[PDB]
């Protein structure tokens, strides 16, 4: 389920960040993370999915 | 392009419901409206698109 996968992978990519030193979170990724849960309440939860691999594309 | 028609769309619409009565105009005419300017703005101008459809299909 799509709605499923994105509320599973936005944990999954905070849960990468919590670990990261604050400082060293870079900006697109934290962009990428908020398009992800602006389309996630928006209902288009596919769209979220695909916010979150550019939010994985920006991990350190 | 779609950001062309998204815009030229909303005008559209918006023209139809202008002659309406303010009070006979429908609010899922309004929701979808809103919806495609939202859409709009985020530059989804493909899901604009697909929300003036849905717009159209509310006008009396
Ligand atoms: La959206």
Do not use: M, W
């Amino acid at each position: 389920d799509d709605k499923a996968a994105c509320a599973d992978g936005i944990a999954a990519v905070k849960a990468r960040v919590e670990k990261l030193a604050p400082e060293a979170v870079p900006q697109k990724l934290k962009r990428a993370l908020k398009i992800a849960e602006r389309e996630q309440g928006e209902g288009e939860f596919d769209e979220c999915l695909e916010a979150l691999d550019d939010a994985k594309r920006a991990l350190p």
